[PDB]
Write a protein that binds this ligand. Sequence first.
Ligand SMILES: Cn1c(=O)c2c(ncn2C)n(C)c1=O
Ligand SMILES: Cn1c(=O)c2c(ncn2C)n(C)c1=O
Ligand SMILES: [Ca+2]
Ligand SMILES: [Ca+2]
Ligand SMILES: [Zn+2]
Ligand SMILES: [Zn+2]
Ligand SMILES: [Zn+2]
Ligand SMILES: [Zn+2]
Lengths: 524, 524
Amino acid sequence: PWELTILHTNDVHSRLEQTSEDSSKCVDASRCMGGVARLFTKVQQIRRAEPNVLLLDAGDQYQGTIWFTVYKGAEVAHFMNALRYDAMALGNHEFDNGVEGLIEPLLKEAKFPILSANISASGPLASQISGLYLPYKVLPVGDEVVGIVGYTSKETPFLSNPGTNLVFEDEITALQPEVDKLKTLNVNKIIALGHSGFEMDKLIAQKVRGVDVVVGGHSNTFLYTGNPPSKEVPAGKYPFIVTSDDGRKVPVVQAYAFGKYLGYLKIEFDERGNVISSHGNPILLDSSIPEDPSIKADINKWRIKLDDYSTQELGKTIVYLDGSSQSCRFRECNMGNLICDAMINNNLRHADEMFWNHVSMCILNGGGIRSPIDERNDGTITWENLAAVLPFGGTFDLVQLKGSTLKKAFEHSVHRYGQSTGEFLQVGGIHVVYDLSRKPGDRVVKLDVLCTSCRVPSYDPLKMDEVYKVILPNFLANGGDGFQMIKDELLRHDSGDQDINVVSTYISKMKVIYPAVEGRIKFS
Amino acid sequence: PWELTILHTNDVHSRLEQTSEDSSKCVDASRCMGGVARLFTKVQQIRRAEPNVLLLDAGDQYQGTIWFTVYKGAEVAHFMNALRYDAMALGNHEFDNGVEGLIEPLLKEAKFPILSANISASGPLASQISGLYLPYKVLPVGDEVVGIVGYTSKETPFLSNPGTNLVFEDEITALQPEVDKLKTLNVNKIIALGHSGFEMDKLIAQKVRGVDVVVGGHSNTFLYTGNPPSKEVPAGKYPFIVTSDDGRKVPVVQAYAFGKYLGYLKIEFDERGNVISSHGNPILLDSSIPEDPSIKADINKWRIKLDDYSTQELGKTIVYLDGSSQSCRFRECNMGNLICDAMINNNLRHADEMFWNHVSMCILNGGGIRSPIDERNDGTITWENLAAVLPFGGTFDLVQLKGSTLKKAFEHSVHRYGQSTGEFLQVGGIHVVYDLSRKPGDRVVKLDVLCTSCRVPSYDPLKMDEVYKVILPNFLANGGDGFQMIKDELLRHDSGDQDINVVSTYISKMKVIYPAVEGRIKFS
Ligand SMILES: Cn1c(=O)c2c(ncn2C)n(C)c1=O
Ligand SMILES: Cn1c(=O)c2c(ncn2C)n(C)c1=O
Ligand SMILES: [Ca+2]
Ligand SMILES: [Ca+2]
Ligand SMILES: [Zn+2]
Ligand SMILES: [Zn+2]
Ligand SMILES: [Zn+2]
Ligand SMILES: [Zn+2]
């Protein structure tokens, strides 16, 4: 039997430095985790011991911290080249800075193949991009070869900025002929590496004949066999075994997100490329593993430009930005209006004749707004100021919610009004009226929402059975601040851009901001 | 007696081409008026007949048509140099593109002195601008000399974009020492040429000892002795005689606006520089005066770049821009919200610790919105599209109104609701609720306005005795669409920027717009 070691990361999301336990800023180094210097140590160790090793990334290196804001992907090419990745699949966030911000910094600078079989271009762009990403690569491994076929979320146009040329094809439809073609070229060991989420990974394992292993991403899925090593709760065993339509057992793996874990799967193949066995587990990259000193020194050198950037002017405000708890946990506050407006602006994507924009609505718990910004520093706003308001290193995500769920959320928002609790909601594209003289649970007396399926945006009553797209913190999509109804009832959830980066982009674009308190939230 | 002919223009406001009777676009050439080609004919004629002639401009050449949008003052330097102006005073609108847009195109390219005695600079800007404008110029005229002393509205920081360095001093305080100094240099014939408005011109005539003639602007004041030649109603005789504190008679002149008239004042002086007599009248520049063929040919050549600019993309909309009468004369319409938002953005000026901005409020009669803009031309908006919405060539002006006046205006807005009349108001920084079941005159049941004297903008009830700044069309400041209460009751009125230019600037800055109907106007 020929034994392959697959080492894999996904959704690293700009966690170049070691992080806290919850993948925010590292404060107590003896409890910090991940980062590329520690990943380098562990990959180097495994490559010393195991003969046949591939190091794979299933996409979404782009987006998540100030590293991406400043270096725009040059950090990804540099540090992935230093760790000697063997292949990467394109994720949705690789399109955040458009095609041009993918071609230049990543596709031209990576020393490893970048893959996606389900993205096609036309016109001049097809000539410009030809060969800079590939459907698959056949890689030598010891005295064998392994085919790696890539795939990217078909939902990328809703979740990033790929532009109107590129077309994202159904993953299974695009993959099967490429896997068919590898079989005709005598490549009998095939890894599908891609970025569509755990549910689609299982469907690919089931339906794409000839795929031996699926290495995925997007859904930040944690799989584990045994007692979990940290706080993440497993969605299933590692690997997750799918019974294929061709009647094989196909292992499916993912490794959470944020560089906290290194996926590690050992596959035994027979002489005909059939998987005889598969076993492994993700490795927690905790402080017991030292940071490679050379990578850490390069990381500290690259940090200098980040520190310099963090105190530069992004834009100006001519208004005080009231992010005080006394405002934002009790009533409409202008800092909440600013952040929700920035969240909606971040989610303007290219539209059908069917909507002016696919999403119009935002909610933000006042518990998430942690500072005001004073306008009397010559109106200057810096990144450092925004990091005081939004200190948790979260994302602003897209969810689909029934109107009944969202009405429940607005009831939760005031269920114990008066105590300075964090669940009080700041909004965009939503007008709510409360009557606090009613029983908890029955205090929302008006709730109107901004249409999407309309050429002129206007407000309509919320409908209980209708499914709304909403931009909201990752923290609330995960039921934070008591919003269990959101976690339990949401129909779709895709992670979005870093919270600070959303607001800093909007302020940069606007140049001069003056958000008002304007009646989005009233009390009767 | 030594006889001087003063020819003078003021508030020409980018009317390089001949205009209609009401100073909008020329449609029936046999009834058109003004423009620099006709002004050239008439000035040339007078210079052939009269020995001692000065051609003076009292400021506000900048701003008013697409000529300024595209050429940014290069057209002013070019055509004023062709007509051989002898001197110009700085107006407020000369600061519309900041100091840099005054230095370069006008102060560096004018072949005639540019004057203002009441503007001072400090730091590097004082070195950069030194001598490029002057307090006064002594000009040879035949075998005599005439001193010309300049002045500019002290209110320029509220009415344009001069920046935070320049300081606008009280006109009379700044002028007297300069006039004193000319007396010490044996210059006994002194013209005050400046841009502060008719009321301040009369105060200067009264109080600045040694001034013999005041040639002013800003207030678009029409003076006439006799039957008026056109539709403009005189504010007083030409010249308007002020009895000075030193007990002389001092003539004060102005010549309306828009290049429609050439001011013409004949002054007889005695050997000691005392005015013995003054007489004249503005000359209507009507079609009986031919356009100089050489200037007209240069005008037609420069127009090519205007026609080219007018079809270029300014920005995009992802929403239909509903400027239909069926919407904007009956309810809140998103095109009205766009234009009011653009009007408020145009009026962001540099602020004290005392306000976030000096003005927060806008009203726009639906009668002034004349077209929608379809978003299905790839979202493109051009100047030509905006000219369909705003076809009258007006300005968006700043007025001060008591809250009682503005409540009267909102009652007028719905006094005969239901007939598709133009007075129905679109708004910004104002939330109004009507109850149409009440008697005409008593239908406004809520009227809340955006604070200025506040660090966080929020809405408060309108107060009847408080004076509000409002941005609104020139047409309404003049009582158009039945708003007689605005014309009769306003406490201050300064003309602002061209209507189309305000909206095109905002769209350019924003890049992508998506104005909503959001509850600024409701019905109970
Ligand atoms: C209140 N709150 C938290 O307490 C929090 C968080 N992310 C992590 N934590 C712990 N966010 C975004 C938040 O709003
Ligand atoms: C309705 N209306 C007019 O009729 C008009 C005008 N300017 C001139 N006229 C005639 N404006 C701006 C306007 O709103
Ligand atoms: Ca196989
Ligand atoms: Ca005199
Ligand atoms: Zn991701
Ligand atoms: Zn993803
Ligand atoms: Zn003017
Ligand atoms: Zn003026």
